[PDB]
Amino acid sequence: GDQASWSHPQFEKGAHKFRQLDNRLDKLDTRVDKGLASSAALNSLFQPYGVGKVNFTAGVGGYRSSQALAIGSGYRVNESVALKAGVAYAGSSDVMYNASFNIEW
Amino acid sequence: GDQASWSHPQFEKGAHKFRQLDNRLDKLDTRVDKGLASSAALNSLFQPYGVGKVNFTAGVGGYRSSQALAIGSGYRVNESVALKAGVAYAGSSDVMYNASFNIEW
Amino acid sequence: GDQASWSHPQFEKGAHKFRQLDNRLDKLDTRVDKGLASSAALNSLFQPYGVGKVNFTAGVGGYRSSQALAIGSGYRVNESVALKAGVAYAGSSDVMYNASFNIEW
Known part of the structure; x- marks a missing residue:
């Protein structure tokens, strides 16, 4: 039983199975921690006004116990129509x- | 060991257990990929102005390697108070x- | 096989392994359900105008089949630069x- 809490080893091949599953779960949660932090940072912008020019949107965020940096940019034309698009950088392989x-209306 | 990387079959019933767990993990990650993409798309709006009328908010987004379509609408009354509410459609069973x-202030 | 669908018990220690994994997966999905709901609620704000004063941003959201309450506040100085920061409360141990x-630009 490893140390006490973990206790991965179970059978002749249960140790490898338990470790693989435990590693996968941790990887999923990680992607969500950093992925949400970055996404939020980007979705936390809104471009300050824009009657017919371009606006730069960027900022950082955090979720649970992680941190990520997000960035983006869009053109605010007129006072009726608009558009926003940007990319967020989370962890290492967590980009959106x-x-x-x-x-x- | 299936092919090499996978290697689900372990014991008399380890093959079914490993497959079930692997399938569940993939399903969780999927919901997060599309769920985050849609959510972001909706949270990427902000309604262009609004002194006392209605505004339509909608847009698409993407996370990791997925894509989702989000929509919403809210009424911007006055220049002090506001409100925004919408629904996002991700994948198939991923709605928020x-x-x-x-x-x- | 427990009842039919579950069927956690497999070997001498497969019942505990299957239950632990199933519990972990459910915990991950939960954090994402409430975590996304709260995050969105916060990212669903944008502060109504702001030429050089403070604005309070707050609201609730929901994802899949969960609900969370998010809050925040920022100071909108000038009509060129801006800043927004807030905290979101999801479930119990899901704070961002x-x-x-x-x-x-």
């Missing part, structure tokens, strides 16, 4: 890209 | 709903 | 913090 559009 | 409010 | 900045 956004692209939405705002409109007045 | 938002509803927040902005205020000037 | 954001902090980004907007700028006109």
